[PDB]
Design a protein around this ligand. Structure first.
Ligand SMILES: Nc1ncnc2c1ncn2[C@@H]1O[C@H](COP(=O)(O)OP(=O)(O)OP(O)(O)=S)[C@@H](O)[C@H]1O
Ligand SMILES: [Mg+2]
Lengths: 468, 40, 127, 578
């Protein structure tokens, strides 16, 4: 196709520039901005009129002048070239490779915003994911097609947990009723606003265990242009959707820090002078985060799946901050790290009491994990809650001297935190985690363990805490 | 051990050369196709 | 122990990419020196005509001075001034009515903007 | 037919010029794709159109054609057992012609035009007909669907189709002035459908949840708001109401929420049983789905489509429950559109007319005498999603002024898995007094007294909690410890309810009354024992507490006998203390 250029630049201020004429530019189109020195910038048409179009420049507007700057159309809709050989590669967050290898050959050019999934075309997420972490797999299990964020603080080890989940995540089809050779599984990893140190950590982690071969990495650095942080999850989810719904891959998507993405979104919105929100964030931030998160799921008639684990840093550990609040309003549950458990040296510091997996109740049972999974999880939650509410009353009362059965739960709570939650870098299987849970269930079979009625006691009770 | 790495790199370069060889015949056909497509 | 997979994938990727780059160099060198073929006026006529297809009204068309007169049927029909710039080898560009909009049909630009779509077919045909 | 061109595009808002003659709030087809839009501002030769579909890729100069009609739904047979988008497009037929993704610009009739219906006339030639009268009936899913005269139509009947199979487009009644009446009619979604009279609501809307049906009841024509932070269980409560309530027809509006929830409904409801008729639950249900990643402007349309469909089913004599999955998303859509209009925001960015829109939406509910002379009702339960759980945000506060019931969810109860997680101290209901005669006649003559005693016990327990935290539970008298333990029993055995348990998910009024009687009998006997010198330690150790706790898992069939044996055991236990 021929190339048309617009030289009618009439106004530049901040990140916006106005092009007169240019009524041929469609709304939302991607344009190339070329200055007098031959440098080419990117831009997106955010508002088009008969008199002029408004373009938001991707980078800074430094060096642009009204005399020599020219704007040309690239495409009416932002698109990403995708193909199956993206696995094992790395990208900068705008699709450009940063692994040193040559660019991929595009098999398809999909729009990066995607399209909404028809609710009648979806199906219920029904197959669990073994992350290797007991406090997730047993009590907040991840299901193929779920979106389940990890809520963490600024000082908590969220990157380490993300890397561990990326390394350890597996389908476990052998336990499944539809026993079969493992279906293709892949991990799409998106890093947003990441530092060079964290980037080195992630590259080393993915290289040292060969997980990179079944992975696609989108890596947006903290010093990269702010628009690339916006576009990075679009590219990641476009690749994930392509793989899952055109090659039957089970794709797990990890978004490293949605707080950085939301800061970038606030910056862009304030640049466009939108109506503000609760704390300066755009009023439409819910819609944008929804257009990112809702792309996960399982589709009827297709074997593939998309699973999302967005990690975000809660500012000042405030769960009522706009970022975690909207993310919880969109996603099906959350995993919340505890700073107190981190102070006690426990890793991963997942606090099971405020964590929740909404899709858990239909992802576990017979033909999926083990038949005792849900009852065991209910019992563990009840017993840990009882131990915590005993130790909180001890502080107010100031008396260790208390009823005998209370001391069994305090000891149970301590052993639970020190053995079940505290697992280090161990890649526990679901069977191993259930064995550890049943060993921890050293409470009375009937006088205690009464929150959930179960006859699995005769089958699994009596374990004596013995570790490997 | 080193032998596995050496064998892998040797077979990798060999098959890279093989793919180059089996592209060599169709290079000019692809060039002609692109020339006929670019020109109006 | 698993690095062999990375080596084989990297080697195949490098081979295919270098082959495609060589194909690009071959096609860009063959696309060069079009006017040596005496059929060039017949294709550059359509090359200039598609510029007027893009621009509903054009003030002038700009190309290499030797490439100008062959297109002057469109000059008579539309009244477009013919402007000379020898640096604009193998291409036709036009200035819009107000002078703000312009279009360019240089062969290298067409190759650059088409290669992204064409590579999908080229790689499949080549292998 | 006014036709113009696109002058400006900025997000979901399009300025069309050359539209002189277009009317406010008329539907426009924007662009070459014919995207549905609605005019919300007129200015000289131009019109401001809010597009109910994605505007990406639109180009200036594309045609804009006004249909000359407001946003209207088709009301007739074929809506039940279906799922619709924000502007009443069948999502299943959209899928069968578009695939797994929802692309814009798809045109499809709301009501199936090729389906045959068993017409059974009721009017005769020469009859005088007024708006809302019944022309005839059609069987839909065991429901007797009534073909109503449109509310604005009056005349005399000329011809009536005899009987048999007809489509909704075939005119079944022809008036003497040539007005043909079909099985369906259109109605503007922003106009409340007229009724003869508004009646006082005197019967309860039985939700099946003990706390709501007992402590904070809502009447049949009432309105209830259930605000709460994320994860508090709004949607679970809505779906429990959809599954278990006594409404003839349930209309569920997924305004800007997860698509997985709509899929869950679509998959599970066909397998469940309608609690009233015994048929499949999905035949009772109409779903209007506009997920969070669907176009934002369509949320407002979806709310009105849902309420208009509920009113239409009310006009036929049914009692309709309307569930709005979140009105906060509708408020956010209004805020976005207002920002595109450059209107001055009132509070937290919302337009100043937000309260007006909410009031006009919630005012459509009520128990009425329909234009046809039958009695119908609409019950609205609207969830609210305050940012950060802040109940002082404008949507919650403007909602509280108009709703009759306030079901306040609590994050502290949701974190600790104490579901339904209703904050019984912050919640209230204004229908509790007006329903007392019905409770006396249909449940038990003394039911209001049992409910009042339970509420008093909860009040005393809540008060004594402060003394517990101050002095410590060890250093207060055995009577107050008994009150604390009875409050704990009330909470964990009566107020707590597992919506996923096969039996606990539903609880009849008489089962709740039996549990309350068990708890209060135990409390009075234990109080007498405490006065009798019995230590609270052995009272707390009595096995009767296990029967009381397990009472809620007893099925409705077994519960009347379980209650008798529990009464006898309560008597015998504190007789055995001697
Ligand atoms: N009555 C209940 N019985 C059992 N589990 C419940 C109940 N209410 C809530 N839950 C659990 O808590 C989760 C929260 O569900 P909802 O109350 O529907 O969330 P919400 O109120 O819609 O808030 P969101 O996440 O912003 S839509 C459910 O997925 C269940 O796991
Ligand atoms: Mg909800």
């Amino acid at each position: 196709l021929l190339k048309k250029e617009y030289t009618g630049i009439t106004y530049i201020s901040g990140p916006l520039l106005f092009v007169e004429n240019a009524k041929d530019l469609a709304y939302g189109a991607i344009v190339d901005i070329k200055d007098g020195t031959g440098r080419v910038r990117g831009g997106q048409v955010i508002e088009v009129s008969e008199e002029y179009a408004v373009i938001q420049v991707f980078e800074e507007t430094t060096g642009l002048d009204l005399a020599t700057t020219s704007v040309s159309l690239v495409e009416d809709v932002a698109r990403l070239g995708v193909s199956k050989e993206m696995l094992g590669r790395r990208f900068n967050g705008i699709g450009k490779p940063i692994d040193g290898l040559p660019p991929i050959t595009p098999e398809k050019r999909l729009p990066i915003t995607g399209l909404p999934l028809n609710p009648v075309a979806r199906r219920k997420p029904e197959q669990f994911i073994q992350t290797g972490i007991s406090t997730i797999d047993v009590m907040n299990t991840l299901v193929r097609g779920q979106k389940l964020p990890i809520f963490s603080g600024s000082g908590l080890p969220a990157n380490e947990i993300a890397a561990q989940i990326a390394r350890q995540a597996t389908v476990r089809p052998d336990l499944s009723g539809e026993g079969e050779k493992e279906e293709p599984f892949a991990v799409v990893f998106a890093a947003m606003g990441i530092t060079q140190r964290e980037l080195s950590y992630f590259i080393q982690e993915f290289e040292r265990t060969g997980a990179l071969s079944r992975s696609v990495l989108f890596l947006n650095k903290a010093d990269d242009p702010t628009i690339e942080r916006i576009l990075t999850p679009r590219m990641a989810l476009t690749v994930a959707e392509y793989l899952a719904f055109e090659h039957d891959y089970h794709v797990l998507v990890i978004l490293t820090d949605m707080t950085n993405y939301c800061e970038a979104l606030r910056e862009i919105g304030a640049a466009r002078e939108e109506i503000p929100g609760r704390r300066g964030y755009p009023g439409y931030m819910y819609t944008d985060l929804a257009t990112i998160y809702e792309r996960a799921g399982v589709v009827e008639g297709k074997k593939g799946s998309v699973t999302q684990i967005p990690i975000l840093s809660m500012p000042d550990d405030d769960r009522t901050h706009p970022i975690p609040d909207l993310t919880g309003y969109i996603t099906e549950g959350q995993i919340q790290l505890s700073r107190e458990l981190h102070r006690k040296g426990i890793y991963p510091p997942i606090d099971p009491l405020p964590s929740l997996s909404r899709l858990m109740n239909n992802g576990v049972g017979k033909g999926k994990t083990r038949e005792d999974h849900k009852q065991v999880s209910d019992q563990l939650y009840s017993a840990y809650a009882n131990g915590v509410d005993i130790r909180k009353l001890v502080a107010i009362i100031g008396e260790d001297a208390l009823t005998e059965n209370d001391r069994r739960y305090l000891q149970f709570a301590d052993a639970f935190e020190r053995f079940f939650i505290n697992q280090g870098q161990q890649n526990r299987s679901i069977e191993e985690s259930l064995q550890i849970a049943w060993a921890l269930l050293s409470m009375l079979p009937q006088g205690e363990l009464k929150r959930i009625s179960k006859d699995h006691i005769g089958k699994y009770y009596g374990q004596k805490l013995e570790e490997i | 051990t080193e032998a596995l790495l050496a064998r892998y790199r040797e077979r990798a370069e060999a098959e890279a050369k093989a793919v180059r060889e089996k592209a060599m015949a169709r290079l000019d056909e692809a060039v002609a196709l692109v020339l006929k497509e670019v020109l109006p | 122990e698993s690095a062999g997979e990375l080596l084989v994938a990297t080697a195949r990727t490098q081979a295919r990419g270098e082959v495609l780059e060589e194909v690009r160099r071959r096609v860009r060198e063959a696309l060069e020196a079009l006017p040596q073929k005496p059929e060039w006026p017949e294709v550059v006529r359509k090359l200039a005509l598609e510029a007027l297809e893009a621009l509903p009204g054009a003030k002038a068309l700009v190309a290499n001075p030797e490439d100008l007169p062959h297109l002057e049927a469109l000059a008579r029909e539309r009244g477009v001034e013919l402007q000379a710039e020898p640096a604009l080898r193998l291409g036709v560009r036009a200035v819009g009515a107000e002078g703000k909009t312009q279009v360019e049909n240089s062969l290298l630009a067409r190759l650059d903007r088409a290669w992204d779509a064409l590579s999908s077919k080229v790689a499949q045909a080549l292998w | 037919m006014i036709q113009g061109v696109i002058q400006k595009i900025a997000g979901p808002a399009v300025i069309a010029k050359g539209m002189l003659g277009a009317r406010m709030y008329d539907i426009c087809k924007v662009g070459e794709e014919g995207l549905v839009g609605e005019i919300i501002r007129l200015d000289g030769d131009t019109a401001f159109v809010q597009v109910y579909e994605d505007t990406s890729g639109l180009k200036v100069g594309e045609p804009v054609v006004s249909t000359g009609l407001p946003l209207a739904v088709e009301l007739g047979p074929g809506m039940l057992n279906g799922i619709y988008d924000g502007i009443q497009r069948p999502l299943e037929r959209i899928r069968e012609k578009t695939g797994i993704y929802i692309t814009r610009g798809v045109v499809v009739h709301a009501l199936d035009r090729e389906k045959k219906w068993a017409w059974t006339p009721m009017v005769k030639p020469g009859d005088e007909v007024r708006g809302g009268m019944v022309l005839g009936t059609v069987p839909e899913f065991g429901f007797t669907h009534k073909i109503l005269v449109p509310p604005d139509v009056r005349g005399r009947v000329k011809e009536v189709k005899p009987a048999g199979e007809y489509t909704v487009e075939e005119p079944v009644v022809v008036l003497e002035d040539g007005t043909e009446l079909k099985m369906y009619h259109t109605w503007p979604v922003r106009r409340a459908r007229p009724v003869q009279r508004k009646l006082d609501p005197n019967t309860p809307f039985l939700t099946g949840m003990r706390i709501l049906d007992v402590l904070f009841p809502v009447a049949m024509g009432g309105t209830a708001a259930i605000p709460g932070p994320f994860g508090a269980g709004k949607s679970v409560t809505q779906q429990s109401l959809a599954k278990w309530s006594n409404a003839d027809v349930v209309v569920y509006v997924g305004c800007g929420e997860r698509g997985n929830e709509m899929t869950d409904v679509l998959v599970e409801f066909p397998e469940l049983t309608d609690p009233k008729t015994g048929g499949p639950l999905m035949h009772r249900t109409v779903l209007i789905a506009n997920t969070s990643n669907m176009p934002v402007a369509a949320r407002e349309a979806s709310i009105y489509v849902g309420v208009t469909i509920a009113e239409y089913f009310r006009d036929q004599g049914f009692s309709v429950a309307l569930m709005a999955d979140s009105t906060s998303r509708w408020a956010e859509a209004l805020r976005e559109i207002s920002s595109r209009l450059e209107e001055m925001p009132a509070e937290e960015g919302y337009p100043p007319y937000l309260a007006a829109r909410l009031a006009a939406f919630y005012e459509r509910a009520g128990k009425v005498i329909t234009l046809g002379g039958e009695e119908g009702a609409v019950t609205i339960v609207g969830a609210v999603s305050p940012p950060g759980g802040d109940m002082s945000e404008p949507v919650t506060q403007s909602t509280l002024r108009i709703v009759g019931a306030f079901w306040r969810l609590d994050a502290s109860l949701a974190f600790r898995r104490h579901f339904p997680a209703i904050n019984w101290n912050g919640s209230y209901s204004l229908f509790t007094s007006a329903l007392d005669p019905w409770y006396r006649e249909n449940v038990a003559e003394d039911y209001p007294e049992l409910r009042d005693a339970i509420s008093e016990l909860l009040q005393r327990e809540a008060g004594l909690q402060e003394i517990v935290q101050l002095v410590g539970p060890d250093a207060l008298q055995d009577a107050e410890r008994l009150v604390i333990e009875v409050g704990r029993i009330i909470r964990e055995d009566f107020l707590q309810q597992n919506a996923y348990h096969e039996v606990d998910a539903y609880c009849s009024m008489k089962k709740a009354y039996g549990i309350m009687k068990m708890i209060l009998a135990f409390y009075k006997e234990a109080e007498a024992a405490i006065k009798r010198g019995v230590s609270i330690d052995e009272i707390l150790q009595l096995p009767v507490l296990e029967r009381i706790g397990r009472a809620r898992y007893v099925s409705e069939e077994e519960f009347p006998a379980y209650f008798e044996e529990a009464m006898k055991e309560i008597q015998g236990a504190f007789k055995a203390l001697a």
